[PDB]
Write a protein that binds this ligand. Structure first.
Ligand SMILES: Cc1ccn2cnnc2c1NC(=O)[C@@H]1CCOc2ccc(Cl)cc21
Ligand SMILES: Cc1ccn2cnnc2c1NC(=O)[C@@H]1CCOc2ccc(Cl)cc21
Lengths: 304, 304
């Protein structure tokens, strides 16, 4: 027992981190097969970021201007192209450490692990979620761009995020591995409106199921509710509306614990209306929303 | 910016995880050079755990009774010995993936990463701390024994923990890599008294410095205190007493922020006396004590 904000083992992804330098800018790159993926803002200087014309800046760059270093050895760049907000640097050597992989565009509310990197070297790994407003609350300093978000299913790594930016609000924006930003963000140093950061209701309920499984049960009450009644409370508290799809995904957790999804919704409604009253659930004094129902089953069953 | 409960990249340790089976029991092993380290309770059946005589059970075991599998290949066991609560299984092949490493016995209040494993396969990685009562609040299911705790300094892995047990209280006890338990725990299925779980004061102050650095400043007040006055409050709230050694370790964080250690102590005293009043610090509604002053500097500076 015990429940932790657990990340996927990062070994498969560490073997893909490289350093990419173009001019004076250095960021991280992702080497899979003979391609190195990195944010296109690697061609920008600090001045360019205010209003960059990426296509115009790219014309001035050739293959030899992209320095790609994997550990201490230099990779030969034989081609370059810009796909949306990422650069694909074709190299002459396939990464011998390339795991089985996929590129996936995740939905808001989905979780993933981030291997924070600087100069192509890993610093740490943590679990986070794509917020409903398409930002992530990461831990990224200057030089962390190109660090990737991923999930692992047995031996296949599903890369879902590449870090590009920090908004003036301290939150992070990035792209999928095809270079399309999550949300309305652009790779420009300009005022960018992050919308309301709502709580991921289905994840909070999944975490409440994880607490029941691990022994914390004080919040269980004698009440039930309906999806429409629950959603009136959820709206008031800036929670995402719970749908029948969410109830279905919570089916296996409802089955294991013997607590109906709507009964767990009524416990959540009471927790929203009354607060925790100085108590904790799974060592937290707030309702945690960064564990999906799949994460709870995975951690509670020990999937390797 | 942004502050996360970040773990060390787990790649170096994943390359050392093996599966160890003896009779009907299977747990994890740590293969470094030609030795596989694992908990000695691998020789026990569920019945043996109530009152095991390890030396007597070990006599009945020979090298061929320890099945060691690294991925899908079998390792030949050429020797075995019991050192405290761990077994050292000498194999005929040095682990080709052995990183630079050390075995260190950590102090309470020190943090480390855990690579939770089942059947020699990694499931996840999370950061945790050795509690002052010598327990860890992990996420370990049956079969996770032998999973290791470690820290990394550039390229050297310092293994500090090997998981052995879950107390009936849901907390975890284990050993250093020499097989000596942290705390008074024994590898027996018996009632084991975990003492008071105090809060690691120096880590809470380090985390308050991390919050100031990352922009959360509401808790900063107009007050100061003395070490003796602070410690009267710390005692009342089951916090570890702060010493001049702790003040010295917080020196660099005090220097960077310009907030004297005793001034931060007075902010902490007010937070203990008045609570958070429905507010958060670094996304937490409680005072976090699992970041050492070294962790805060490392994360805030991007050490790879
Ligand atoms: C300075 C800094 C600090 C922490 N970071 C955490 N993550 N990235 C940073 C960071 N750098 C940036 O976000 C740069 C600098 C200028 O603004 C933009 C605008 C757009 C894009 Cl794609 C990148 C950037
Ligand atoms: C059953 C279970 C569940 C979650 N775990 C998380 N970690 N280890 C477990 C676990 N198994 C045990 O703790 C065993 C089983 C009997 O009690 C003892 C006593 C002493 C030792 Cl060294 C091991 C064990």
């Amino acid at each position: 027992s015990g429940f932790r904000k657990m990340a996927f083992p990062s070994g498969k992804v560490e073997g893909c981190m490289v350093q990419v330098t173009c001019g004076t800018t250095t960021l991280n790159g992702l080497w899979l097969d003979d391609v190195v993926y990195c944010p296109r803002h690697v061609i920008c200087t600090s001045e360019d970021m205010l209003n960059p014309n990426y296509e115009d800046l790219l014309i001035r760059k050739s293959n030899h201007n992209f320095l790609v270093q994997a550990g201490n050895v230099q990779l030969r760049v034989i081609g370059h192209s810009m796909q949306n907000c990422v650069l694909k640097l074709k190299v002459d050597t396939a990464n011998p450490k390339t795991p089985k992989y996929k590129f996936v565009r995740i939905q808001p509310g989905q979780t993933f692990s981030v291997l924070a990197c600087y100069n192509g070297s890993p610093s740490g790994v943590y679990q986070c979620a794509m917020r409903p407003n398409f930002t992530i609350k990461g831990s990224f300093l200057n030089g962390s761009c190109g660090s990737v978000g991923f999930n692992i299913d047995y031996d296949c790594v599903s890369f879902c995020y590449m870090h590009h930016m920090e908004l003036p609000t301290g939150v992070h924006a990035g792209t999928d591995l095809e270079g399309n930003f999550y949300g309305p963000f652009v790779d420009r140093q300009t005022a960018q409106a992050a919308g309301t950061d709502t709580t991921i209701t289905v994840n909070v309920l999944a975490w409440l199921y994880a607490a029941v499984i691990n022994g914390d049960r004080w919040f269980l009450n004698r009440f039930t509710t309906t999806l429409n009644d629950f959603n009136l409370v959820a709206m008031k508290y800036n929670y995402e509306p719970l749908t029948q799809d969410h109830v279905d995904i919570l089916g296996p957790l409802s089955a294991q614990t013997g607590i109906a999804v709507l009964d767990m919704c009524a416990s959540l409604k009471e927790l929203l209306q009354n607060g925790m009253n100085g108590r904790t659930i799974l060592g937290s004094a707030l309702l945690e929303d960064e564990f999906t129902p799949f994460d709870v089953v995975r951690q509670c069953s020990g999937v390797t």
